[PDB]
Design a protein around this ligand. Structure first.
Ligand SMILES: Nc1ncnc2c1ncn2[C@@H]1O[C@H](COP(=O)(O)OP(=O)(O)OP(O)(O)=S)[C@@H](O)[C@H]1O
Ligand SMILES: Nc1ncnc2c1ncn2[C@@H]1O[C@H](COP(=O)(O)OP(=O)(O)OP(O)(O)=S)[C@@H](O)[C@H]1O
Ligand SMILES: Nc1ncnc2c1ncn2[C@@H]1O[C@H](COP(=O)(O)OP(=O)(O)OP(O)(O)=S)[C@@H](O)[C@H]1O
Ligand SMILES: [Mg+2]
Ligand SMILES: [Mg+2]
Ligand SMILES: [Mg+2]
Lengths: 95, 432, 432, 432, 432
DNA sequence: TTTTTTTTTTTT
DNA sequence: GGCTG
């Protein structure tokens, strides 16, 4: 897989999601966001349990509220198809 | 224009009648555009009528998707409203939209297949089609035009039907007179013909004799061997054409001068096609493999066959069922159906061999019930011929061919005749 | 959907005549909905008619409620419109709503019973039932379906039953006197009729003969081919109708003049119907495809078929089960059930063929147990005849037809009768 | 009182001997209690003795528990002590606690079932029982008690055996004396009786004959037909009772005057019941629908049946299992259990007709290894008969009954007897 | 666990005599536990007896330990109690502790050996074993078991085996002199014994006679019936035990007073066992359901049987075969193997019956070849008694018992013997 | 747990 | 204020 293009594409997709924070240390890339599937916690409006982990072989999104866990490609295919088109093309561009 | 399509699916009976049969869930936005259409499709499947706004709202309330999806569907439903329109602009625009979405989905799937096949094995996410069926998918993206063919009318369309009887381009004549007589003009294109003999009775000698006879009658023949080398089949064809026994070739009783002279004499004759022999490992070729072979033959070798021959269908792999998943019956029936589909697709006479059961071996008669691997093969085959050899027949250099399934004519007439197989020359000769 | 239920109670008599029998204040809510339904019930009790909006508002003014409930009832009453939704969907949805509310009430009741049981005997209420009443309470809430029809009575409805005896509109004659004799007036609409035999015995011959016989009687016949091409089957129909031959068509013995003359003479007949032949790839169609084909046929041409012939049920594809999800006994029976459902929906006589296992391919007789596919097909079938051909029969050109499953009449009155099958003309000839 | 239960399981022996076989892990909360009971149960299973405090502290250390679970279990073990009380209050208090826990678990389970049912398809959980299974669960929880009967204990249960010797259950007599002979006076009230047979051999003929015989004896008979129209079943009954062949009725040989005269002559007889025929679509009726039908029959027609007859068991809905969830065996067994429960609840003799397998078709003898859908039907049934009209009984206008399972008497006394089936009148006559 | 081990070394005798030879210093610790065990071992070596607490403290006072060691040993000595745990659990747990510690020590030793091996050869310890000694060392860790009993060791268990031959530890008498004569003292535990019934002999009469005889001898009998209810089998038992004829109970000749008096007279006798009759449907009880029944009886009824009598082997179901046939050889062979495995694993005498071959039915003599179950029952049966009932024997109220297979003793010693069968009381009496 | 094809084997 | 597989 190609991790840096997943980090670049994931950011834009999760940028729309509110409570968006870039948890980027010296060796990892994570994105904190409110989960778009369930709206995260109904009681707490300030909780961002949706996370993106791009330091692995494949950048994966995981929600700690509704237990959603998916790759960034499936997330883009299911929710942002205009972003999904260029994502797989830039993927083909470098592959 | 998804909102217009949904609105006129709801508030237009004429629009729904034409567009609905073709509308599919993969042609709108994955979100409400898809959720709203899924609601409508479920209502139509449950009640066979177009839902109203109240029905859509009720189905929306009795739905399990999240708050974002619920709000999107509610907004989309609230935005649906009938507008003064004309049937033509809507049908044409819907056709354009459906074609564009089909092309988009097809190219997305093509990219997915390409990026999946370029992965190390055992991690390639199986059940995804291989690159071989990349163009076929695109061919499915172009066959969507809101113009489904209802069918053929007996009385309305009979001039076109009559201009198919003297055409005779469907039938490909044999070279033996008896086979033409029983088939009333030879085999037909887009069919699946089968030879049932047993083990070491014939059944590849007959296929080679047919290939040679078709080759002499200006035909392009594609022999496909799943159990023999390309040089063994070519040696059989050489023995048939050059009238030199296989023993003479093995024992070196034919010189290079005679071989060269016979080959050049055959080449200089105008009435001769091209025969190409291709070998695949047993259980390693299917209909998709044969289509890829056809494409690469057309491109690289400008070779367009009409008499495609497969040595044994039972030795081939199904292109749909996973290996050793279903029993022999289902697998062999599927393989035969796929081969017949290939034959009708490329409009070629397809010839194949089939084994008989152990009980039919060394028997003076072979029935249709003696088919080995599946009872569906006789049902999905246009013509079948049973090759029977006994000790008396072997001593007479003859074999009894019984018409088991004769779809081109009446099998009761000329059911059993004696061919003069010559095993040294791999040739069938008549007795008339 | 309480608003819809109340609106169609007030503004629809047909809805009121099927739901009011089964309706209670506990089913709706504890707020404005229950109060509105209580007003409706009080008005209908005092005056045996459905109230109007003005009458309901006057009653609300007369009745006493607190401020909140008064405002809620006024707001809810303001929201009532005719909104002519479909009757079937409305009754199904209100049945579902009643069932779910009744289940919720029953669960709350049993929870209250359990809570009261744990209380000390002095504190506990004697009105609530014991725990032993938990099961039946949950059962009476599962028997609240909307169905007022109790059924026949055999003594209070014998006049209506006798009138039904005179309704012979379901029967469709056969054009063959023996088939009418054994079916007591021909086949019936909405029934699954099967013509089974071995491989290459004349199943499609019999189907085309039935199609031609129904065509000559003025019926609309829809022939759905699964193996042969449209022009091939139409050739068999031409051989049956024009009555010349199958080989003479392909051997040029018929001059165009004769073909045109015979076709125009058949066109001049006012007793002729319409025949449409549709071909599908093997394993790619079912009632879901057939229903769309029916809709397209009705839209494009004034063609509503009375007879629907399917070339083979086995070659067909089930709607819910995938191509190879389950074994033969299931998906074949599923396809049979779907075809019978399609026939009873369209009120058409459905004909199809069935294959016989290898055990009876060369036997003088065939039984019901000799069905190649699932044995559920000879459970959904209604008139499963059987075609048996031997050497003696083929010598006399007389196939034997055995009555295998006879739902219309007595299966054993004429169990085995000889036909006069002419294979060249693709015609069944009665024997006298 | 979980702490007391654990303390007296550890420190008391008579209490342990009395209550241990009925304790279960589901009766304890998920905190320290369930883990402590798990340790105790594992120790008892491994050493067949009650563990001490040291044993459990050793088992706790040798356990895969989290810090919270470990601390809770250790605290609970420390809190245990042998409080001296009476071994007559402890047992009843433990029984009450176990019953309350069982009721709580059943309530939670049915709430989960109802939540699962409302979910849309392709998302709802599979293998989870449907809504109709809710009462049965609630029937199981109420049956929990510290008294268990496993088998019949000689010298310990002999008063009940003497009662069984001296007393005989009430019997609803047949009209055929042979059935009374083989059943010692008829069939009991709360029973499920099955008349298995092959396809198109007289499943409905026998059921209609039984319905007519019971109707002539003054019983209220409900005929639930799942495959045939109401008029067809009522016509079978008319042929049975009016002594007119079905051929005569269809052909119109009998006039309306004769039909009315015979019907009124039957009406004037005091020894006549009421027969009500209700038709349901295939797979559209279940036990709860039957209960709703019974309720509406009682309320709107003052009709309480005794001889409820179901045409075919294999077509009815499961009422406990979602459609197309389990295999045929499990679904048919569930249907049989539901129907027998309905018969017991309504105190009605219930008669049905299952279908035998393809092997039993045209077989001169059948056994329990011939039932097609489910071999668990005999276990659930109370009397099961068979029909063996295969080849020569039809020519002789006779039948044969195997008596596969007879709980009313002994099956190996009159196991096979010949029945004079008359198909024109749809009745059974005796050969005597 | 170490505290318990030390405490029960100090305060027990059987535990000490059982576990002392397998106790080593390296098994405990490197701290207080090791020092305490060293004190115990030193005391037992100097004085061959278990030390007391005061003696242990005196030894600790007169010992070379530091302050921390002194404190640890003093605390551990003060933490030892004479509490009474069960012996089996204590031995098993200390065996597990010893095995775990030995495995840990061996693993650490091999790791240290490997670490020393990867060191400059000039610089390494000589005392450390070479790498090639690693597989043996682990073996010494795996060869640690407090008690070694793997099978029967000839020449090492001859004294125990002789106590078996003199005490007849395996034999179970018959109460019939002839049956004890031919079995050398009765049947054996863990055996399958079957009766072969010719035409005209019942299979349940002999089984009920054996059950009654075992009941009168004090054995717990579990009678599992297939074709009969619990009451009927217990009625046969009553007929044999109370001397009342079977038909007299049904007629009513015997009154409740005599029945109760005889039952209480039997109950007064202390030489009477318990009989538990359990009924199962035909084909619904494999030899895995019997295991569950035994578990339930042991847990709830505390009933652990010594005799298990199955009504009929043929009616049972083969768990391994799964599929069920009315009369199939493969199932009977599997059923016999499963029942004999159950008998072996439960240490019970298992009885069953079968029908002899038709040829055996006609012939008074029955050959192992003349058996319905051939090579299946005379291969898995320790004893197979054959019962012959001819006309002359029936007229004399007798049955000829023939011995067809006797694993117990010589088959030809006393092969034929006449038995006094009473069919009314269901009894076998001897013949002088 | 049944169902259906094909084969191979074996038992009666 | 982070936490998955
Ligand atoms: N090299 C050869 N020389 C002479 N005769 C041969 C030679 N090869 C085959 N034959 C003869 O041809 C007969 C049939 O050959 P084939 O066509 O290979 O039989 P087959 O049925 O195709 O074999 P299988 O079992 O289907 S792979 C044999 O029985 C031989 O008598
Ligand atoms: N072109 C033809 N000319 C003459 N007779 C023919 C011709 N085609 C078929 N037949 C005869 O038709 C008989 C059976 O016809 P079919 O319809 O092929 O039987 P069927 O195989 O059961 O039907 P299918 O498989 O759906 S085509 C054969 O035995 C032939 O005798
Ligand atoms: N109209 C009729 N006139 C005379 N005999 C008939 C008539 N209808 C049916 N029969 C006969 O009645 C027999 C039994 O039919 P059914 O009562 O339907 O048995 P069945 O088991 O219910 O059939 P199914 O439901 O399709 S499996 C048939 O085999 C026919 O011989
Ligand atoms: Mg070959
Ligand atoms: Mg065919
Ligand atoms: Mg019926």
């Amino acid at each position: 897989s190609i991790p840096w293009i997943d980090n670049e594409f994931a950011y834009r997709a999760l940028a729309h999601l509110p409570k968006f924070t870039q948890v980027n240390n010296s060796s990892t890339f994570k994105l904190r966001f409110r989960c778009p599937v369930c709206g995260d916690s109904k009681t707490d409006q300030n909780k961002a349990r949706g996370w993106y982990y791009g330091d692995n072989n494949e950048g994966n999104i995981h929600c700690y509220n509704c237990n959603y866990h998916a790759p960034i490609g499936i997330y883009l295919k299911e929710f942002e198809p205009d972003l999904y088109r260029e994502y797989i093309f830039e993927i083909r561009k470098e592959k | 224009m998804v909102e217009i399509i949904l609105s006129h699916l709801i508030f237009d009976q004429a629009y729904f009648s034409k567009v609905w049969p073709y509308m599919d869930s993969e042609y709108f936005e994955s979100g409400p555009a898809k959720n709203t259409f899924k609601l409508i499709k479920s209502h139509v499947n449950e009640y066979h009528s177009v839902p109203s706004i109240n029905a859509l709202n009720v189905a929306l309330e009795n739905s399990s998707f999240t708050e974002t999806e619920y709000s999107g569907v509610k907004t989309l439903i609230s935005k649906l409203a009938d507008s003064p329109e004309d049937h033509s602009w809507l049908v044409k625009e819907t056709e354009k939209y459906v074609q564009q979405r089909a092309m988009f989905n097809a190219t997305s799937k093509i990219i997915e297949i390409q990026t999946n096949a370029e992965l190390p094995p055992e991690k390639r996410n199986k059940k995804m089609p291989d690159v071989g069926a990349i163009p076929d998918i695109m061919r499915q993206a172009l066959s969507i035009s809101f113009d489904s063919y209802v069918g053929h009318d007996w009385m309305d369309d009979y001039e076109a039907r009559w201009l198919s009887y003297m055409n005779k381009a469907r039938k490909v004549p044999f070279k033996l007179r008896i086979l033409n007589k029983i088939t009333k003009g030879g085999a037909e294109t887009g069919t699946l013909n089968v030879l049932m003999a047993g083990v070491n009775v014939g059944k590849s000698l007959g296929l080679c004799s047919l290939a040679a006879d078709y080759l002499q009658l200006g035909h392009n023949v594609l022999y496909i061997s799943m159990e023999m080398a390309e040089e063994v089949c070519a040696k059989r064809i050489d023995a048939n054409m050059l009238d030199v026994s296989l023993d003479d070739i093995d024992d070196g009783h034919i010189s290079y001068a005679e071989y060269k002279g016979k080959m050049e004499k055959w080449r200089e004759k105008s009435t001769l096609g091209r025969l190409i022999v291709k070998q695949y490992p047993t259980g390693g070729a299917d209909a998709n493999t044969f289509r890829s072979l056809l494409n690469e033959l057309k491109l690289k070798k400008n070779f367009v066959p009409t008499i495609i021959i497969v040595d044994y269908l039972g030795i081939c792999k199904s292109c749909r069922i996973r290996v050793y998943s279903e029993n022999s019956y289902t697998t062999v029936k599927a393989i035969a159906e796929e081969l017949r589909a290939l034959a009708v697709e490329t409009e070629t006479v397809l010839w194949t061999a089939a084994q008989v059961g152990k009980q039919a071996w060394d028997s003076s008669d072979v029935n249709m019930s003696d088919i080995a691997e599946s009872a569906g093969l006789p049902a999905t085959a246009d013509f079948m011929l049973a090759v029977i050899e006994t000790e008396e027949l072997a001593a007479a250099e003859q074999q009894l061919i019984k018409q088991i399934k004769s779809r081109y004519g009446d099998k009761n007439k000329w059911n059993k005749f004696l061919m003069g197989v010559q095993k040294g020359n791999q040739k069938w000769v008549e007795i008339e």
